[PDB]
Amino acid sequence: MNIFEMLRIDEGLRLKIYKDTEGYYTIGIGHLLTKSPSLNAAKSELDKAIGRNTNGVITKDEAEKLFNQDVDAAVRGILRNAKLKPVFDSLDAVRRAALINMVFQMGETGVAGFTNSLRMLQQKRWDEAAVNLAKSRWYNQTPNRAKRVITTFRTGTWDAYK
Numbered sequence: 001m002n003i004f005e006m007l008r009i010d011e012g013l014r015l016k017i018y019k020d021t022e023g024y025y026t027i028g029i030g031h032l033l034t035k036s037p038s039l040n041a042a043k044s045e046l047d048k049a050i051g052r053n054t055n056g057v058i059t060k061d062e063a064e065k066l067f068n069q070d071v072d073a074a075v076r077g078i079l080r081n082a083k084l085k086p087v088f089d090s091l092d093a094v095r096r097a098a099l100i101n102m103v104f105q106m107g108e109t110g111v112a113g114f115t116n117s118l119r120m121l122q123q124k125r126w127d128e129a130a131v132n133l134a135k136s137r138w139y140n141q142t143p144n145r146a147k148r149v150i151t152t153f154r155t156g157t158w159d160a161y162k
Contacts (some may be wrong), residue, residue: 001158003071003097007104009161010145015063017042017056021142027056028063030104031070074100077108084111087118095121098152105145106138121153130154 011030017039020026025033025042031049033042039056046054050062078084078099088099099121102111112118114136120129130150133139139146151160 001161003100004067006097006101006152006158006161007067007071010101010105010148013060013063015058015060017046027058027066029067029070031063031066070104071100074103074108077103081108081112083115083118084108087122090122090124092156094156094158095153098149101149101152102138105142126154126156 008029013029014027017025017027017033020030020032024035025039027033027046033045033049036042043054043056046056046058049066050058078088084099084103088096091099099111114133117129117132120132130153133150133153134146136146139150148160152158
């Protein structure tokens with residue numbers, strides 16, 4: 001297991017524009033296109049992202065290309081963020097992937113605001129951090145996925161993805 005396999009499990013693979021769990025136009029492996037309710041706006045973002053006229057459909061290789069860019073972008077966001085980088089640097093590789101997962105889903109700014117959870121993670125108070133992480137809109141709206149990510153923070157194992 002690794003961050004790419006982890007996020008493929010959590011995000012799936014769809015080659016046509018679909019709406020994600022928040023109702024937003026998405027494609028590929030969790031590649032958010034736009035929060036606009038306009039399908040034409042999402043198609044325009046998609047064409048720009050892929051570099052050709054797609055009319056809403058892409059290939060598996062194209063989906064994996066956006067996925068690599070998006071994982072890269074999550075790591076880049078963590079390392080440039082004054083709140084996330086110390087936490088990330090403090091963690092083992094399995095728990096680092098749990099943090100990348102959260103940033104992929106909610107964005108750098110969203111996760112950086114989890115101030116109390118981030119502190120419990122930095123203190124390595126794993127059960128307390130896990131309890132705090134679940135007191136969130138994130139957990140209530142996507143509980144099965146949040147439970148997998150939280151179990152990864154709590155244990156430092158891949159047991160929730162086996």
